[PDB]
Design a protein around this motif. Structure first.
Motif, PDB file in Angstrom:
ATOM      1  N   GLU B   4      57.976  -4.886  29.324  1.00  0.00           N
ATOM      2  CA  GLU B   4      57.384  -5.647  30.421  1.00  0.00           C
ATOM      3  C   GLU B   4      57.206  -7.126  30.093  1.00  0.00           C
ATOM      4  O   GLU B   4      57.203  -7.950  31.014  1.00  0.00           O
ATOM      5  CB  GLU B   4      56.045  -5.039  30.835  1.00  0.00           C
ATOM      6  CG  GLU B   4      56.160  -3.659  31.456  1.00  0.00           C
ATOM      7  CD  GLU B   4      54.806  -3.033  31.737  1.00  0.00           C
ATOM      8  OE1 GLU B   4      53.846  -3.319  30.993  1.00  0.00           O
ATOM      9  OE2 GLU B   4      54.707  -2.246  32.700  1.00  0.00           O
ATOM     10  N   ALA B  28      65.547   1.435  34.911  1.00  0.00           N
ATOM     11  CA  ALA B  28      65.333   0.414  35.931  1.00  0.00           C
ATOM     12  C   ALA B  28      64.434  -0.704  35.421  1.00  0.00           C
ATOM     13  O   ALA B  28      64.661  -1.879  35.729  1.00  0.00           O
ATOM     14  CB  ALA B  28      64.741   1.044  37.188  1.00  0.00           C
ATOM     15  N   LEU B  29      63.404  -0.358  34.648  1.00  0.00           N
ATOM     16  CA  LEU B  29      62.541  -1.375  34.055  1.00  0.00           C
ATOM     17  C   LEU B  29      63.309  -2.232  33.053  1.00  0.00           C
ATOM     18  O   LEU B  29      63.154  -3.461  33.023  1.00  0.00           O
ATOM     19  CB  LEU B  29      61.338  -0.693  33.404  1.00  0.00           C
ATOM     20  CG  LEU B  29      60.366  -1.414  32.473  1.00  0.00           C
ATOM     21  CD1 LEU B  29      59.744  -2.628  33.124  1.00  0.00           C
ATOM     22  CD2 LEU B  29      59.291  -0.436  32.041  1.00  0.00           C
ATOM     23  N   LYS B  32      65.490  -4.558  35.067  1.00  0.00           N
ATOM     24  CA  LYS B  32      64.706  -5.623  35.677  1.00  0.00           C
ATOM     25  C   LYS B  32      64.340  -6.690  34.657  1.00  0.00           C
ATOM     26  O   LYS B  32      64.420  -7.890  34.944  1.00  0.00           O
ATOM     27  CB  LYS B  32      63.450  -5.037  36.317  1.00  0.00           C
ATOM     28  CG  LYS B  32      62.490  -6.073  36.851  1.00  0.00           C
ATOM     29  CD  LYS B  32      62.967  -6.601  38.187  1.00  0.00           C
ATOM     30  CE  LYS B  32      61.796  -6.995  39.061  1.00  0.00           C
ATOM     31  NZ  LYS B  32      60.698  -7.585  38.252  1.00  0.00           N
ATOM     32  N   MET B  33      63.943  -6.277  33.457  1.00  0.00           N
ATOM     33  CA  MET B  33      63.587  -7.230  32.419  1.00  0.00           C
ATOM     34  C   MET B  33      64.795  -7.762  31.665  1.00  0.00           C
ATOM     35  O   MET B  33      64.641  -8.651  30.822  1.00  0.00           O
ATOM     36  CB  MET B  33      62.597  -6.596  31.445  1.00  0.00           C
ATOM     37  CG  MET B  33      61.280  -6.186  32.088  1.00  0.00           C
ATOM     38  SD  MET B  33      60.113  -7.544  32.335  1.00  0.00           S
ATOM     39  CE  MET B  33      60.600  -8.190  33.935  1.00  0.00           C
TER      40      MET B  33
ATOM     41  N   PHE C  38      54.295  -5.440  40.325  1.00  0.00           N
ATOM     42  CA  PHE C  38      55.478  -5.232  39.500  1.00  0.00           C
ATOM     43  C   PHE C  38      55.802  -3.749  39.390  1.00  0.00           C
ATOM     44  O   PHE C  38      56.949  -3.328  39.603  1.00  0.00           O
ATOM     45  CB  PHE C  38      55.254  -5.842  38.117  1.00  0.00           C
ATOM     46  CG  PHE C  38      56.385  -5.615  37.166  1.00  0.00           C
ATOM     47  CD1 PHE C  38      57.510  -6.413  37.213  1.00  0.00           C
ATOM     48  CD2 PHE C  38      56.321  -4.610  36.220  1.00  0.00           C
ATOM     49  CE1 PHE C  38      58.549  -6.212  36.339  1.00  0.00           C
ATOM     50  CE2 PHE C  38      57.361  -4.405  35.345  1.00  0.00           C
ATOM     51  CZ  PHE C  38      58.475  -5.207  35.405  1.00  0.00           C
ATOM     52  N   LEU C  42      59.038  -1.740  41.017  1.00  0.00           N
ATOM     53  CA  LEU C  42      59.921  -1.019  40.111  1.00  0.00           C
ATOM     54  C   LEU C  42      60.029   0.455  40.485  1.00  0.00           C
ATOM     55  O   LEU C  42      61.105   1.055  40.377  1.00  0.00           O
ATOM     56  CB  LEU C  42      59.408  -1.174  38.689  1.00  0.00           C
ATOM     57  CG  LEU C  42      60.471  -1.044  37.619  1.00  0.00           C
ATOM     58  CD1 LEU C  42      60.134  -2.059  36.571  1.00  0.00           C
ATOM     59  CD2 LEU C  42      60.468   0.362  37.058  1.00  0.00           C
ATOM     60  N   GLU C  45      62.174   0.931  43.305  1.00  0.00           N
ATOM     61  CA  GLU C  45      63.566   0.772  42.900  1.00  0.00           C
ATOM     62  C   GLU C  45      64.225   2.106  42.560  1.00  0.00           C
ATOM     63  O   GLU C  45      65.448   2.241  42.684  1.00  0.00           O
ATOM     64  CB  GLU C  45      63.649  -0.187  41.712  1.00  0.00           C
ATOM     65  CG  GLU C  45      65.049  -0.433  41.201  1.00  0.00           C
ATOM     66  CD  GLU C  45      65.872  -1.252  42.170  1.00  0.00           C
ATOM     67  OE1 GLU C  45      65.305  -2.152  42.821  1.00  0.00           O
ATOM     68  OE2 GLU C  45      67.088  -0.996  42.282  1.00  0.00           O
ATOM     69  N   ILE C  46      63.448   3.104  42.144  1.00  0.00           N
ATOM     70  CA  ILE C  46      64.007   4.380  41.710  1.00  0.00           C
ATOM     71  C   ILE C  46      63.598   5.548  42.591  1.00  0.00           C
ATOM     72  O   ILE C  46      64.168   6.641  42.441  1.00  0.00           O
ATOM     73  CB  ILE C  46      63.638   4.688  40.245  1.00  0.00           C
ATOM     74  CG1 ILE C  46      62.287   5.398  40.177  1.00  0.00           C
ATOM     75  CG2 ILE C  46      63.579   3.419  39.446  1.00  0.00           C
ATOM     76  CD1 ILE C  46      62.079   6.161  38.899  1.00  0.00           C
TER      77      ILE C  46
END
Lengths: 51, 58, 99, 193, 148, 203
Positions: B4, B28-29, B32-33, C38, C42, C45-46
């Motif tokens: 994060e 996905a995280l 995104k990062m 955030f 996220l 998103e899934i």
RNA sequence: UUGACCUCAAAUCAGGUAGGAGUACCCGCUGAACUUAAGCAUAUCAAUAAGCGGAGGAAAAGAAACCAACCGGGAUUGCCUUAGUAACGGCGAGUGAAGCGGCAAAAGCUCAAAUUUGAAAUCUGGUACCUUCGGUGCCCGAGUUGUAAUUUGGAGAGGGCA
RNA sequence: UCUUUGUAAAGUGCCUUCGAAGAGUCGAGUUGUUUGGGAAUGCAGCUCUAAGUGGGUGGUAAAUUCCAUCUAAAGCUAAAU
């Protein structure tokens, strides 16, 4: 749950107390109550604080 | 937490995770990062890597 | 916002000096946080959309906002929630058109 | 069933009320037990006053807001103004209420002065000192009585300016009663060209 | 005292004051307010007219503290000020020193004009006042200021 | 923290991924026993939130309970009473399926004390819960001051007495003007309001 | 095949724990009818009796997703009162609380949701010793799918000045 | 009584950036029961099923503005009884 104590007006209680105090001084009432105060000098009887 | 704030230079995600919800967001995280992640095989391998039984992410 | 010093009327009550106490942090509960925005973006998103949300998007596209709000009042609990959900599906449509 | 000219009496006694009858024979014994508990607790907390310091608070409703009574505890604003932290206040004997808010300057001032004089009067024994035995008093409530604040002097000058104090009441009530109608009328007059 | 009752006097007589023909039975008319429309309607109509039915509006969650409003009349008004000060004020009946009477502190909500206060001035602090009460205070030379 | 992501994802119930997981997991739990020990919480975040800590002496038991109303257990629907009590079919049990599940699990693992239980799945005929229990005689719980209250004796069979979260919810224990009947105990309140209190000097 | 992991088992494996009793009071479930209505079906009796499950010396409740509408109170409980009132009710018979107020007692709080990441700092057990309701070493084990420290909305965290 | 330990632990002043707060849950419909709770007080079954200045409540159903007050869906806790 029978009633055991009985409410009495405060002022009536004090009236009765004052009557009893006043009757203390009456010679005839003390004799009638039977208190053997014949050989007492005088009532209401008073003593010193040595008592 | 490392991902994060982008302190991770590489992330390896075990496919063998029993409740998959624990790692479904990891790709996905990571995307995104903008960190590189690989779905590696075997949480037992990661456990051996970190001297435990299972790790599920390294 | 001071009383009128009268026992009757709109602002009835005693005229006193007010000091507007410091807001409690309990009152900041609905507030939005960077962390939760955030995470929620996220997770969206899934996760994807719900069947009734896709039906809502199609309803806004074809039928209209009123019909969508009726169906979302049925699907959700209350009329206010229907309005909010239709607003967010409008936002989804607009975001799709923009990117 | 129904009989001569008598009031209609509503006596709710057609359950098994006889099973739930509580006769307070233990009133005197309970009073003695309470006094004994107070005595033993005072002996246990021997230098301490057996109760906490309560604030001055204004009673809520329109039936009681004319009176001032005891509160639950001093606000965090009040303890900060008195110049001490809530935790230490709790340890040295002040009731601290966290959820009470002070919107009132004179209740604020009265409670801060209560706290200031409390700190002036009590003496705290140090943790590792010489214990200056201090002849415990047993009631913070009696030591710091709640005093109803006086509002105005008994005799002052008469100021008349011709409002009768009844027309003002009537007009205030009427303005409250017809505010929404007048606002709506203003809206329609504005919106119609 | 049981010794004073009429049961002690009925000891000996067969029926205990309850009659030979119509005995003391259990509930010959019903229990409670039974038959108020049918066989006790005569008692209901004679002694409690208006019993059956409903008339007004309802009021869910009625609070009596909202309607707390004791009324003070002008005749009782002068009893609010301390008795020893009363002769003093009556003799020094003048403006610029009139006594202020806090009826709300005394425990009254509204001032009503039951009439005939003296013509001294007086300050009546109320939160509700009657038309005639304010008129009579003004006639006496005082004033009523409204409080809350 | 992954628990926040777990929480939001779990909120997204009708998303396709959770629909798939729901189907596969409900099949698996149906195939397993009605009450069976679970190796780990299938909702780690929810167990953690409800009180579970991943240390020795904390147990998770999965349990499924049958859905629907409570049929009145009378032969041939005969109630022998008033037409008001003649109903049999659409009567509703007054405790939740969660409470029924956690009471059954407590009966099974009588040595443990139920901390809580949470919903994990449901279908037409079964609802599925996971019950968090604590071992009150494990030393890791007897020491470690965060959890001795469960090994104190007044907490025996909290699920049976109604002291768990769902128990409070069912008993109506909550502050407000809506809980005037059930706020400190329905039967306690009823006794208090139906007592005749007579003092020595009667009023 | 050097061995793990996960899930599921077996042991007269090591150590524990539950069951039953009593059940006046307490926490829930379940649940009548007699009776009243001068008949009776809603109602009432009664959210009672009977039945069932579960505690303690008290239980429960409890530190507001409270009460309010005020010049605002401030966890819970109990008492006096509110009050046989607002309200419910073949609006019939009947039923029927709560706010404020005065008191008794008063006590407050902690978890989840944060990266220790310059060191899983945590804990059960085995073994050994000791001053044994325990303490200290070593050893497996549990645990990163998260045990310690810090924070709980009254706040609080991080970084600076003092 | 020995036990200094520990540049260990805790509290306060000013400013900056933040401030995570519980989901088949709230809520809605309907059903049964219950309540003094009355367009529905609580509870339970079933169906639908959220949000983040959001949510609940504000004892007359509803739609539009505000306002006031708390902060659920997790937990402990003596005394008065």
């Amino acid at each position: 749950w029978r009633k055991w104590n009985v409410k009495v007006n405060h002022n009536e209680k004090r009236y009765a107390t004052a009557s009893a105090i006043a009757a203390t001084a009456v010679a005839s009432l003390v004799l009638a109550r039977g208190h053997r105060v014949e050989k007492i000098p005088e009532i209401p009887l008073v003593v010193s604080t040595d008592l | 937490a490392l991902i994060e704030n982008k302190k991770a230079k590489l992330v390896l995600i075990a496919n063998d995770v029993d409740p998959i919800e624990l790692v479904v967001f990891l790709p996905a995280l990571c995307k995104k990062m903008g960190v590189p992640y690989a779905i590696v095989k075997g949480k037992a391998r990661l456990g051996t890597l970190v001297n435990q039984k299972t790790s599920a992410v390294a | 916002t001071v009383k009128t010093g009268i026992a009757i009327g709109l602002n009835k009550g005693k005229k006193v000096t007010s000091m507007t106490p410091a807001p409690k942090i309990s009152y900041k509960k609905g507030a939005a946080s960077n962390r939760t925005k955030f995470v929620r973006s996220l997770v969206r998103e899934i996760a994807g959309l719900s069947p009734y949300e896709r039906r809502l998007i199609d309803l806004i596209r074809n039928s209209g906002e009123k019909r969508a709000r009726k169906v979302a009042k049925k699907r959700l609990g209350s009329f206010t929630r229907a309005k909010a959900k239709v607003e967010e599906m409008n936002n989804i449509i607009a975001a799709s058109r923009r990117h | 069933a129904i009989s001569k000219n008598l009031p209609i009496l509503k006596n709710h006694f057609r359950k098994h009320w006889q099973e739930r009858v509580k006769v307070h024979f233990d009133q005197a014994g309970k009073k003695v037990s309470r006094r004994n508990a107070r005595a033993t607790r005072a002996a246990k907390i021997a230098p301490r006053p057996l109760d906490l310091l309560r604030p001055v608070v204004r009673a809520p409703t329109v039936k009681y807001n004319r009176k001032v009574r005891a509160g639950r505890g001093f606000t965090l604003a009040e303890v900060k103004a008195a110049g001490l932290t809530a935790a230490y206040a709790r340890t040295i004997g002040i009731a601290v209420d966290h959820r009470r808010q002070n919107r009132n300057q004179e209740i604020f001032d009265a409670n801060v002065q209560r706290l200031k004089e409390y700190q002036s009067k009590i003496i705290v024994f140090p943790r590792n000192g010489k214990a200056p035995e201090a002849e415990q008093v047993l009631s913070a409530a009696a030591t710091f009585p709640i005093a109803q604040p006086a509002t105005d002097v008994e005799a002052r000058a008469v100021q008349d300016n011709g409002e009768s104090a009844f027309r003002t009441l009537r007009l205030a009530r009427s303005e409250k009663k017809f505010r929404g109608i007048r606002e709506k009328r203003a809206r329609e007059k504005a919106e119609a060209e | 005292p049981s010794r004073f009752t009429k049961t002690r006097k009925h000891r000996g007589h067969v029926s205990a004051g309850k009659g030979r023909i119509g005995k003391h039975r259990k509930h010959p008319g019903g229990r409670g307010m039974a038959g108020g429309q049918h066989h006790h309607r005569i008692n209901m109509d004679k002694y409690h007219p208006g019993y059956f039915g409903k008339v007004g509006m309802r009021y869910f969650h009625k609070q009596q503290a909202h309607f707390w409003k004791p009324v003070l009349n002008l005749d009782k008004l002068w009893t609010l000020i301390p008795e020893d000060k009363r002769d003093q004020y009556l003799k020094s009946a003048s403006k610029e020193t009139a006594p202020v009477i806090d009826t709300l502190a005394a425990g009254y909500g509204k001032i009503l004009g039951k009439g005939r206060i003296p013509n001294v001035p007086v300050i009546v602090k109320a939160r509700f006042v009657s038309k005639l009460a304010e008129e009579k205070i003004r006639a006496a030379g005082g004033v009523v200021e409204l409080i809350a | 923290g992954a628990y926040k992501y777990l929480e939001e994802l779990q909120r997204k119930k009708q998303s396709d991924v959770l629909r798939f997981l729901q189907r596969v997991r409900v099949w698996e739990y149906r195939q397993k026993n009605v009450i069976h020990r679970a190796a780990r919480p299938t909702r780690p975040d929810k167990a953690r939130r409800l009180g579970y800590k991943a240390k020795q002496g904390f147990v998770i038991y999965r349990v499924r309970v049958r859905r629907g109303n409570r049929k009145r257990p009378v032969p041939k629907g005969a109630t022998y009473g008033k037409p008001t009590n003649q109903g049999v079919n659409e009567l509703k049990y007054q405790r939740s399926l969660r409470a029924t599940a956690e009471e059954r699990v407590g009966r099974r693992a009588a040595n443990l004390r139920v901390l809580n239980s949470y919903w994990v799945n449901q279908d037409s005929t079964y609802k599925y819960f996971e019950v968090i229990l604590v071992d009150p005689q494990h030393k890791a719980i007897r020491r470690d001051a965060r959890y001795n209250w469960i090994c104190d004796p007044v907490h025996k069979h909290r699920e049976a007495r109604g002291l768990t979260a769902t128990g409070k919810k069912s008993r109506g224990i909550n502050k407000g003007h809506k809980f005037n009947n059930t706020k400190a105990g329905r039967r306690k309140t009823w006794k208090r309001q139906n007592t005749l209190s007579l003092w020595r000097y009667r009023k």
